Write an enzyme that holds these catalytic residues in place. Structure first.
Site, short mmCIF file in Angstrom:
data_model
loop_
_atom_site.label_atom_id
_atom_site.label_comp_id
_atom_site.label_asym_id
_atom_site.label_seq_id
_atom_site.Cartn_x
_atom_site.Cartn_y
_atom_site.Cartn_z
N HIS A 141 12.00 -8.20 -2.60
CA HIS A 141 10.89 -9.06 -2.18
C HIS A 141 10.54 -10.18 -3.16
O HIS A 141 9.79 -11.09 -2.78
CB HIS A 141 9.61 -8.25 -1.98
CG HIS A 141 9.68 -7.31 -0.82
ND1 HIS A 141 10.07 -7.70 0.45
CD2 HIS A 141 9.36 -6.00 -0.72
CE1 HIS A 141 10.01 -6.67 1.27
NE2 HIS A 141 9.58 -5.62 0.58
N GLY A 149 5.23 -7.36 -3.22
CA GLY A 149 5.52 -5.99 -2.86
C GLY A 149 6.16 -5.12 -3.93
O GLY A 149 7.20 -4.50 -3.66
N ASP A 176 16.44 -1.03 3.91
CA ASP A 176 15.06 -0.69 3.62
C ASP A 176 14.20 -0.72 4.88
O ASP A 176 14.49 -1.45 5.82
CB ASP A 176 14.52 -1.68 2.58
CG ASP A 176 13.28 -1.20 1.91
OD1 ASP A 176 12.20 -1.50 2.43
OD2 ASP A 176 13.39 -0.56 0.84
N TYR A 314 8.92 6.44 -1.50
CA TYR A 314 7.65 6.82 -2.09
C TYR A 314 7.38 8.31 -2.01
O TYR A 314 6.33 8.77 -2.46
CB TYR A 314 6.53 5.99 -1.43
CG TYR A 314 6.93 4.53 -1.53
CD1 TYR A 314 6.78 3.83 -2.73
CD2 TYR A 314 7.53 3.87 -0.45
CE1 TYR A 314 7.18 2.51 -2.85
CE2 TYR A 314 7.94 2.54 -0.57
CZ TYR A 314 7.76 1.88 -1.78
OH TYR A 314 8.15 0.58 -1.93
O1 LIG Z 1 8.99 -0.65 -0.20
C1 LIG Z 1 8.48 -1.77 -0.11
N1 LIG Z 1 9.20 -2.87 0.01
O2 LIG Z 1 10.59 -2.79 0.12
C2 LIG Z 1 6.99 -1.94 -0.11
C3 LIG Z 1 6.38 -3.19 -0.14
C4 LIG Z 1 5.00 -3.29 -0.07
C5 LIG Z 1 4.21 -2.16 0.03
C6 LIG Z 1 4.81 -0.90 0.06
C7 LIG Z 1 3.99 0.32 0.19
C8 LIG Z 1 4.35 1.63 0.04
N2 LIG Z 1 3.24 2.34 0.31
C9 LIG Z 1 3.17 3.78 0.28
S1 LIG Z 1 1.84 4.31 -0.82
C10 LIG Z 1 2.70 4.45 -2.36
C11 LIG Z 1 3.16 5.69 -2.79
C12 LIG Z 1 3.81 5.80 -4.01
C13 LIG Z 1 4.00 4.69 -4.80
C14 LIG Z 1 3.55 3.46 -4.37
C15 LIG Z 1 2.90 3.33 -3.16
N3 LIG Z 1 2.22 1.52 0.61
N4 LIG Z 1 2.67 0.29 0.54
C16 LIG Z 1 6.19 -0.80 -0.02
K LIG Z 2 15.58 -3.81 5.43
ZN LIG Z 3 10.44 -0.78 1.56
#
Ligand SMILES: O=C(NO)c1cccc(-c2cn(CSc3ccccc3)nn2)c1
Ligand SMILES: [K+]
Ligand SMILES: [Zn+2]
Ligand SMILES: [K+]
Length: 400
Positions: A141, A149, A176, A314
């Protein structure tokens, strides 16, 4: 032979961030607990002979003033004092805030993934490795002058740029849950890097791109890059089989038509049914067959030098469960040598994190696409006409 990026400082740096914690350590320690590491060539992260040389390498994509800001943010967080009003504005102008805040090792942390994925690309280039894995990389990102992100530097763009600068074409496959917008943008005018993201997209869902833009249409590149950006957005809840059937012919068609010199795969694990995102319902099952394992095995059967990268994920122990199996599958497909992974998690340092049952399998019980296939097939035709590529239109048409 199959390479994998790690190192003591590298591990420690990849584990310093507030969002991802010790995830990278769980991943590598489960790979090690499964005795896969003697099968793998260790690829060390790249290091530089000067600040100027590191700077030159990162600003192949990022702006100098952005790198300056990120380095100043680390310094500012290595002191007790709050940031000044002027410094807050400076960070805000680069989106160094919100989900990308500062912390005491943010620059070193972000740089570490770049060091990893550049050495992984160099290993493929000098033919030391047929495939290289970097589970500390895959931050798709980040933009030229903008963090986004949880991504501060775009290690994938930098790696891909090193591959193309060695006629060379790169196919980038982004598995992803999220649209790979930073890499798509970086190569938006470049026919030599074809990008393909499959992802969830819906109103309000991060980052918002990779979907419909008079009936709405898909933008897909610009200038000489027209038709070179591919996207397949899917609805929430999709399972292994439906996701596999959705991407399988696209993957096979892209390989036949583009004939890539290299493939780069972002292998974010947030599509997993057990990810707290809870959007897709993919598994790490290997008899349902894991959507991830299906796609990776298909890409590996092409025998093109391949970079395999991490990304989202995550549920840290379940990301480890997946990426361990991706890693064993790669060894099997490349060396020709079968890997036997016991269904029970072996005792090791993080063994308690895999309770309450300690199994390798994740703990889960499991026409739009057809229009998308016709759209993508036509886009591939346009790409191949614009770029004067030869290809049997009826050999590709039968894949679908
Ligand atoms: O993976 C991504 N981009 O490729 C991406 C981009 C933006 C936001 C999020 C995201 C993930 N979560 C889950 S909460 C959590 C749980 C553990 C660690 C950190 C967050 N909430 N927002 C993921
Ligand atoms: K993707
Ligand atoms: Zn992701
Ligand atoms: K492109």
């Amino acid at each position: 032979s199959v390479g994998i990026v790690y190192g003591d400082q590298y591990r420690q740096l990849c584990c310093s961030s507030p969002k991802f914690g010790d995830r990278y350590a769980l991943v590598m320690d489960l790979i090690n607990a499964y005795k896969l590491i003697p099968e793998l060539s260790r690829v060390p992260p790249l290091q530089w002979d000067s600040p100027s040389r590191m700077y030159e390498a990162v600003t192949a994509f990022h702006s100098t003033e952005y790198v300056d800001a990120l380095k100043k943010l680390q310094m500012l967080h290595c002191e007790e004092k709050e940031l000044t009003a002027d410094d807050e504005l400076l960070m805000d102008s680069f989106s160094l805030n919100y989900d990308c805040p500062g912390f005491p090792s943010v620059f070193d942390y972000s740089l570490a993934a770049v060091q990893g994925s550049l050495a992984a690309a160099s290993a493929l280039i000098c033919r030391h490795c047929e495939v290289v894995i970097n589970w500390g990389g895959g931050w798709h990102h980040a933009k030229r002058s903008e963090a986004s992100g949880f991504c501060y530097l775009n290690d994938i763009v930098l790696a891909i740029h090193r591959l193309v600068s060695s006629q060379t074409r790169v196919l980038y496959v982004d598995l992803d849950l999220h649209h790979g917008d930073g890499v798509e943008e970086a190569f938006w005018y470049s026919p030599r890097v074809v990008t393909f993201s499959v992802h969830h997209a819906s109103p309000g869902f991060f980052p918002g791109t990779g979907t419909w833009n008079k009936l709405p249409i898909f933008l897909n590149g610009a200038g000489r890059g027209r038709f070179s950006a591919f996207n397949l957005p899917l609805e929430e809840g999709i399972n292994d089989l439906d996701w596999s059937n959705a991407i399988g012919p696209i993957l096979d068609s892209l390989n036949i038509v583009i004939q890539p010199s290299y493939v780069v795969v972002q292998c974010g694990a947030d599509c997993l049914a057990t990810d707290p995102m809870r959007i897709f319902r993919l598994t790490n099952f290997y008899p349902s067959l894991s959507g991830y394992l299906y796609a990776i095995k298909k890409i590996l059967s092409w025998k093109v030098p391949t970079l395999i990268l991490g990304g989202g994920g995550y549920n840290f122990p379940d990301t480890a469960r997946l990426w361990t199996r991706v890693t064993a599958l790669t060894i099997e497909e490349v060396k020709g040598k079968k890997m036997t992974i016991s269904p029970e998690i072996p005792e090791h340092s993080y063994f308690s994190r895999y309770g309450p049952d300690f199994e390798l399998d994740i703990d889960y019980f499991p026409d739009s696409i057809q229009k998308h296939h016709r759209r993508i097939l036509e886009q591939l035709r346009n790409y191949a006409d614009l770029n004067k590529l030869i290809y049997d239109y009826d050999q590709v048409y039968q894949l679908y």
